Each structure stands twice: as structure tokens, then as C-alpha cells.
Design an enzyme around this catalytic site. Structure first.
Site, PDB file in Angstrom:
ATOM      1  N   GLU A   1       0.600  -1.329   0.018  1.00 23.71           N
ATOM      2  CA  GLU A   1       0.175  -0.252   0.071  1.00 23.71           C
ATOM      3  C   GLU A   1       0.289   1.331  -0.192  1.00 23.71           C
ATOM      4  O   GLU A   1       0.811   2.218  -0.550  1.00 23.71           O
ATOM      5  CB  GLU A   1      -0.994   0.113   0.846  1.00 23.71           C
ATOM      6  CG  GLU A   1      -2.271  -1.198   1.252  1.00 23.71           C
ATOM      7  CD  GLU A   1      -2.864  -0.502   0.039  1.00 23.71           C
ATOM      8  OE1 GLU A   1      -2.945   0.341  -0.066  1.00 23.71           O
ATOM      9  OE2 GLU A   1      -4.012  -1.610  -0.275  1.00 23.71           O
TER      10      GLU A   1
ATOM     11  N   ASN B   1      -7.317   9.388  -5.434  1.00 23.13           N
ATOM     12  CA  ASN B   1      -7.984   8.555  -6.032  1.00 23.13           C
ATOM     13  C   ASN B   1      -9.228   9.372  -7.352  1.00 23.13           C
ATOM     14  O   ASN B   1      -9.442  10.391  -7.434  1.00 23.13           O
ATOM     15  CB  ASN B   1      -8.685   7.621  -5.011  1.00 23.13           C
ATOM     16  CG  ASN B   1      -8.792   6.606  -4.165  1.00 23.13           C
ATOM     17  OD1 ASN B   1      -7.364   5.982  -4.482  1.00 23.13           O
ATOM     18  ND2 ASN B   1      -8.878   6.589  -2.860  1.00 23.13           N
TER      19      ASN B   1
ATOM     20  N   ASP C   1     -12.926   8.982  -7.824  1.00 20.94           N
ATOM     21  CA  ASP C   1     -13.378   9.577  -6.935  1.00 20.94           C
ATOM     22  C   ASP C   1     -13.459  11.372  -6.572  1.00 20.94           C
ATOM     23  O   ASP C   1     -14.219  11.971  -5.061  1.00 20.94           O
ATOM     24  CB  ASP C   1     -13.654   9.131  -6.489  1.00 20.94           C
ATOM     25  CG  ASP C   1     -14.098   8.032  -5.341  1.00 20.94           C
ATOM     26  OD1 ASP C   1     -12.446   8.947  -4.591  1.00 20.94           O
ATOM     27  OD2 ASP C   1     -13.910   6.935  -4.792  1.00 20.94           O
TER      28      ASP C   1
ATOM     29  N   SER D   1     -11.581  11.514  -3.173  1.00 21.72           N
ATOM     30  CA  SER D   1     -10.720  11.192  -2.358  1.00 21.72           C
ATOM     31  C   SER D   1      -9.495  10.841  -2.068  1.00 21.72           C
ATOM     32  O   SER D   1      -8.474  10.380  -3.537  1.00 21.72           O
ATOM     33  CB  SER D   1     -11.237  10.114  -1.847  1.00 21.72           C
ATOM     34  OG  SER D   1     -11.656   8.707  -2.590  1.00 21.72           O
TER      35      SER D   1
ATOM     36  N   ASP E   1      -5.879   8.600  -0.372  1.00 25.35           N
ATOM     37  CA  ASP E   1      -5.721   7.299   0.740  1.00 25.35           C
ATOM     38  C   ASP E   1      -4.498   8.095   1.397  1.00 25.35           C
ATOM     39  O   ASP E   1      -3.648   8.504   0.755  1.00 25.35           O
ATOM     40  CB  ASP E   1      -5.282   6.597  -0.277  1.00 25.35           C
ATOM     41  CG  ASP E   1      -5.741   5.115  -0.672  1.00 25.35           C
ATOM     42  OD1 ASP E   1      -7.627   5.916  -0.205  1.00 25.35           O
ATOM     43  OD2 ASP E   1      -5.882   4.315  -1.660  1.00 25.35           O
TER      44      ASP E   1
ATOM     45  N   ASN F   1      -8.552   5.251   3.754  1.00 19.87           N
ATOM     46  CA  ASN F   1      -9.397   6.551   2.968  1.00 19.87           C
ATOM     47  C   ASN F   1      -9.956   7.904   2.770  1.00 19.87           C
ATOM     48  O   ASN F   1     -11.166   6.885   3.846  1.00 19.87           O
ATOM     49  CB  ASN F   1     -10.409   5.564   1.762  1.00 19.87           C
ATOM     50  CG  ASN F   1     -10.854   6.341   0.300  1.00 19.87           C
ATOM     51  OD1 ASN F   1     -10.817   7.103  -0.372  1.00 19.87           O
ATOM     52  ND2 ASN F   1     -11.219   5.411  -0.087  1.00 19.87           N
TER      53      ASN F   1
END
Ligand SMILES: [Cl-]
Ligand SMILES: [Cl-]
Ligand code: NA
Length: 129
Positions: free
Chosen positions: A35, A46, A48, A50, A52, A59
Site C-alpha cells: 500500500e 483516487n 472519485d 478521495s 488515501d 481512504n
């Protein structure tokens, strides 16, 4: 802070993640590797809108507040920036809530695709824990 493999393992064990909800420590180290490459400061945006955050790429759409993810939830009740600290406590406490919500570690796409069903114990091999 960029953790070493055994350093992070020892830190996660001290924070109660070994076998938490049935996931052995190797699963958590493997997820962190893919990750964030063990980097507490990792961020990724991301599609959308958002973002991380941190060593486990938590998220902002659901788990933390970064002030720029409209209509998002803050289920760990923390600013996302707290997930970038060299102290992993906030990330670990939030991860415990995520893994308990029903889908286990399938919430981490990298775990699902790169750790699940592999010999995850290899990730703590050689560590003094
Ligand atoms: Cl393990
Ligand atoms: Cl992946
Ligand atoms: Na720590």
C-alpha cells in the site's frame, strides 16, 4: 518515516495487530508494503476525488477528514493528516475499525491482490518479535 520490515512488525505487534480479527502479523506487514512501501507519508489521490493516507492508505471517503472530500464520512474521527505521523498509533486504531466492519482485509486492494493466499509469514521471517 519509512519503516523497516521488522521494525514495523514489532510496532504493529505492540499495538495489538498480531492475529487481530484472525489476521496474523504477516498479513498486516504485507499490506503495508504494497500500500505504502512502509512510508507513513504516502498519499495517493483516487478517481472519485478521495485520497488515501499513510502506511495503510486509509481512504478519506469513509475513514478520515481531509477537508476536501465532499460528502465523505469520518468514521475514525481523525484528521487524515494524523495518519501520516511517524507514530502509527492512529493508523493502527483506524485499521482495527476497518478490518472489523465485515469485509476483513479485503478492504485493502493490495492485500487482496498481492497478499491474500500467499505465504504471508515470510514477511515477519527473521524478525525478533
Ligand atoms: Cl504471519
Ligand atoms: Cl493491487
Ligand atoms: Na509507532
Amino acid at each position: 518515516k519509512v519503516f523497516g520490515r521488522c521494525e514495523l512488525a514489532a510496532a504493529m505487534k505492540r499495538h495489538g495487530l498480531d492475529n487481530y480479527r484472525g489476521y496474523s502479523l504477516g498479513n498486516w506487514v504485507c499490506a503495508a508494503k504494497f500500500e505504502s512501501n512502509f512510508n507513513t507519508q504516502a498519499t495517493n489521490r483516487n478517481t472519485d476525488g478521495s485520497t488515501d493516507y499513510g502506511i495503510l492508505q486509509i481512504n478519506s471517503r469513509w475513514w478520515c477528514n481531509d477537508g476536501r472530500t465532499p460528502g465523505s464520512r469520518n468514521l475514525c474521527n481523525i484528521p487524515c493528516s494524523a495518519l501520516l505521523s511517524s507514530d502509527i498509533t492512529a493508523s493502527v486504531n483506524c485499521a482495527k475499525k476497518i478490518v472489523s466492519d465485515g469485509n476483513g482485509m479485503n478492504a485493502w486492494v493490495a492485500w487482496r491482490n498481492r497478499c491474500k493466499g500467499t505465504d504471508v509469514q515470510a514477511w515477519i521471517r527473521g524478525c525478533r518479535l
